Amino acid sequence: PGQTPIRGIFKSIAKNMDISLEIPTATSVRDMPARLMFENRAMVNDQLKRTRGGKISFTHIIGYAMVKAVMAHPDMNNSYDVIDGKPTLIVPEHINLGLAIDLPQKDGSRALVVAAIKETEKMNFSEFLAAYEDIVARSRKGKLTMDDYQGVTVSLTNPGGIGTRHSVPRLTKGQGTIIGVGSMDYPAEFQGASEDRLAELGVGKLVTITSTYDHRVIQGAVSGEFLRTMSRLLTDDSFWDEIFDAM
Amino acid sequence: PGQTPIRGIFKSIAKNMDISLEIPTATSVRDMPARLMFENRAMVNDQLKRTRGGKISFTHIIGYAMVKAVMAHPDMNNSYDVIDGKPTLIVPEHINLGLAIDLPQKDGSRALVVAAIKETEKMNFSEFLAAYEDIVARSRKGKLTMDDYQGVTVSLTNPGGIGTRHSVPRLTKGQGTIIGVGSMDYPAEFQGASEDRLAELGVGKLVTITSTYDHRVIQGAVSGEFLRTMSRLLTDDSFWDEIFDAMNVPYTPMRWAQDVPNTGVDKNTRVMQLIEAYRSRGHLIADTNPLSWVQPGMPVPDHRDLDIETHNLTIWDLDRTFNVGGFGGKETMTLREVLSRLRAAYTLKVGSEYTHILDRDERTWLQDRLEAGMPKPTQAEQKYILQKLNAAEAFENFLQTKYVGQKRFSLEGAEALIPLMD
Numbered sequence: 270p271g272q273t274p275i276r277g278i279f280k281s282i283a284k285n286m287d288i289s290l291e292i293p294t295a296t297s298v299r300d301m302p303a304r305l306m307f308e309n310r311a312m313v314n315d316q317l318k319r320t321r322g323g324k325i326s327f328t329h330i331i332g333y334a335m336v337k338a339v340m341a342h343p344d345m346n347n348s349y350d351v352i353d354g355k356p357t358l359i360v361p362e363h364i365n366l367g368l369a370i371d372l373p374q375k376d377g378s379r380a381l382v383v384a385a386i387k388e389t390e391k392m393n394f395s396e397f398l399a400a401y402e403d404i405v406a407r408s409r410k411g412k413l414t415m416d417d418y419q420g421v422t423v424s425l426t427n428p429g430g431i432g433t434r435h436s437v438p439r440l441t442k443g444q445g446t447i448i449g450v451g452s453m454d455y456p457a458e459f460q461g462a463s464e465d466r467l468a469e470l471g472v473g474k475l476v477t478i479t480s481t482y483d484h485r486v487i488q489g490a491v492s493g494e495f496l497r498t499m500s501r502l503l504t505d506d507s508f509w510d511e512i513f514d515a516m
Numbered sequence: 517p518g519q520t521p522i523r524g525i526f527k528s529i530a531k532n533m534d535i536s537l538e539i540p541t542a543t544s545v546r547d548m549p550a551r552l553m554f555e556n557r558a559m560v561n562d563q564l565k566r567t568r569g570g571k572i573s574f575t576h577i578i579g580y581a582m583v584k585a586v587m588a589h590p591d592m593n594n595s596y597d598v599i600d601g602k603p604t605l606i607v608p609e610h611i612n613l614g615l616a617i618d619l620p621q622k623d624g625s626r627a628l629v630v631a632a633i634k635e636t637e638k639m640n641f642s643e644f645l646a647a648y649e650d651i652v653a654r655s656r657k658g659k660l661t662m663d664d665y666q667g668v669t670v671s672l673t674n675p676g677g678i679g680t681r682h683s684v685p686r687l688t689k690g691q692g693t694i695i696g697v698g699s700m701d702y703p704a705e706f707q708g709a710s711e712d713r714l715a716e717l718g719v720g721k722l723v724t725i726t727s728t729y730d731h732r733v734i735q736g737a738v739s740g741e742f743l744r745t746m747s748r749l750l751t752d753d754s755f756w757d758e759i760f761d762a763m764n765v766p767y768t769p770m771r772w773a774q775d776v777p778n779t780g781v782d783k784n785t786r787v788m789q790l791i792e793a794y795r796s797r798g799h800l801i802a803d804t805n806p807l808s809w810v811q812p813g814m815p816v817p818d819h820r821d822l823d824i825e826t827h828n829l830t831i832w833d834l835d836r837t838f839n840v841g842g843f844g845g846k847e848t849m850t851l852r853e854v855l856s857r858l859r860a861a862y863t864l865k866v867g868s869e870y871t872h873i874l875d876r877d878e879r880t881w882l883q884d885r886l887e888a889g890m891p892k893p894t895q896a897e898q899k900y901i902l903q904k905l906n907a908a909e910a911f912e913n914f915l916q917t918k919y920v921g922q923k924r925f926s927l928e929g930a931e932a933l934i935p936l937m938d
């Protein structure tokens with residue numbers, strides 16, 4: 270009980286949240302079927318098990334789809350800044366994808382950090398998976414440099430691990446959008462039903478995906494079309510041929 | 517039409533909303549089943565009605581769960597301030613819970629106020645309910661002081677009364693979080709379906725709960741875990757045992773389980789076995805003791821035969837219809853009505869043992885008279901019972917007063933013997 274100064278990484282988190290108050294933000298929400306993801310992921314993980322490889326996750330698949338979608342809709346990669354006291358649009362050279370990793374510390378307090386995969390628009394699924402696992406591995410061992418925290422152009426977060434349905438997050442300065450992935454589960458009005466009955470009816474599972482963007486440089490129609498493209502890719506023949514071929 | 521200055525309470529509401537612009541906020545949303553809440557609330561309100569008590573609401577239950585959750589995740593109680601021009605985290609001493617009460621005024625304009633229940637982390641459900649009703653009562657009569665509006669650490673709101681699905685509200689300065697409760701109803705894609713069809717499928721009702729927090733002092737993972745804890749408590753065995761114990765209800769609470777298929781032994785067979793179990797062994801849980809006393813060294817018999825889990829039935833069968841073979845003078849009935857009748861006949865103030873009798877005509881005579889119930893007596897009859905009770909007690913007290921030391925072997929404690937013999 271009482272008052273205590275904020276020190277360390279927490280002071281940095283506090284200062285950035287205060288700066289971010291000067292961004293006008295809006296949000297879009299879309300829900301998608303998730304059956305084909307469960308099926309095709311299982312097929313890939315069976316192959317890896319026989320070949321004594323690793324394991325892929327839902328975030329890997331959604332990550333790759335997200336990159337393809339940003340290529341199809343380039344406006345989602347832009348940001349805003351005032352330079353020489355004039356308003357300015359900033360168009361980057363590459364797509365650098367930030368991952369929000371929750372890592373506990375030595376003290377016993379959790380902190381969230383955003384690390385970057387760089388030059389993602391010239392990768393196939395095999396390359397993408399390697400880069401992803403590299404960042405995650407080094408984060409646990411505590412061997413991330415200062416260069417890994419710089420140059421992010423678009424971010425990804427996964428609150429659905431805990432079981433949240435969806436969220437409305439904060440956008441940090443220097444970016445245009447942040448994408449969030451919610452729980453992949455049956456709706457709550459079917460959580461007491463029998464397996465037999467669900468199979469008979471043909472009820473599937475959901476996923477809700479969100480988009481939070483800066484409204485000075487991105488319009489609503491662009492954000493909507495972005496999510497529509499992601500929805501088409503995750504249920505598309507040609508998309509899953511790529512992943513299967515690479516693995 | 518035209519312009520008019522804002523004056524009074526409205527000017528205060530306007531100023532606070534302007535100040536609140538300097539809080540960075542984020543939101544989390546989660547949806548939960550709501551069947552067990554409907555069931556167990558009904559059981560508690562039936563007990564209170566017989567004892568001429570009050571009524572509990574959904575906000576009472578969610579409120580209590582919310583307090584338990586804040587205890588499990590203390591970070592949700594903290595706030596932010598700048599002191600001596602340095603950033604600072606503030607950790608309070610108590611959990612003070614603010615309620616958002618919509619109260620109309622004399623003029624005819626509605627206004628929202630937030631009043632506080634203080635020192636909530638040292639309360640049981642009985643204490644909690646009293647404090648809640650105290651605040652609400654005084655608000656309507658217009659007798660809230662200035663101390664009731666100060667010291668709030670966490671807030672609760674209920675937009676689901678009107679029928680809103682969920683909301684994204686504003687957070688006021690000095691707090692860390694605000695929790696919102698949405699509509700408890702079927703989804704809108706089932707609002708035209710029949711009751712029969714919904715019962716067949718096994719479709720339940722929802723509730724959506726939100727959390728809006730200050731991101732300088734609370735992280736997303738903490739907010740998510742908070743809502744996960746609340747979800748577990750509202751479907752937990754041990755949680756509902758507390759509430760039932762505190763409100764003095766004698767039955768086991770309805771439990772949470774999955775719906776089971778109608779395979780193997782049919783469900784009509786299982787409902788007939790339940791009827792037989794209550795007729796045979798229901799006296800083991802009847803309200804026949806005036807004291808709340810269990811003798812320490814005596815064995816307690818097994819009475820697992822009297823709960824619907826042992827006969828492979830579930831909350832999902834309560835509104836389905838079954839063949840009962842003349843029970844209650846009906847050929848068909850719901851499991852809710854079956855349980856109601858059995859409990860009224862074999863579990864109140866009279867417990868009966870008669871199923872061991874070998875003759876069929878004897879058994880039927882008793883069974884018929886015991887399930888019809890006790891007929892309502894007239895006023896003259898009621899006054900006669902009161903005269904006899906008075907005579908008994910008065911006689912004992914007279915002898916006590918006039919002859920103190922003398923041995924008399926009193927009947928005090930058992931005065932109902934006189935009207936029984938009569």
Ligand SMILES: CC(C)(COP(=O)(O)OP(=O)(O)OC[C@H]1O[C@@H](n2cnc3c(N)ncnc32)[C@H](O)[C@@H]1OP(=O)(O)O)[C@@H](O)C(=O)NCCC(=O)NCCS
Binds near residue numbers: 370371425428450452
């Ligand atoms: C091991 C690794 C390859 C991922 O393995 P994983 O088991 O698929 O991922 P997690 O351990 O985080 O998830 C555990 C479980 O939660 C499930 N899960 C995760 N996110 C989910 C979501 N949004 N909805 C539903 N289930 C989810 C996973 O499917 C897994 O269940 P399973 O028993 O069927 O495999 C590795 O990348 C890892 O551990 N990553 C964690 C950190 C991270 O990815 N952070 C960045 C996220 S943006």
Ligand SMILES: CC(C)(COP(=O)(O)OP(=O)(O)OC[C@H]1O[C@@H](n2cnc3c(N)ncnc32)[C@H](O)[C@@H]1OP(=O)(O)O)[C@@H](O)C(=O)NCCC(=O)NCCS
Binds near residue numbers: 615
């Ligand atoms: C009388 C009292 C004990 C509550 O009684 P109550 O009937 O349970 O509550 P209300 O009168 O607000 O609700 C009326 C009806 O709406 C229903 N309802 C309320 N909130 C609901 C919600 N979120 N979703 C669905 N139904 C809801 C109640 O169940 C009740 O229906 P019923 O006919 O089945 O009883 C008393 O506390 C009261 O009147 N409170 C109102 C003010 C208040 O609680 N304000 C603070 C809320 S944070």
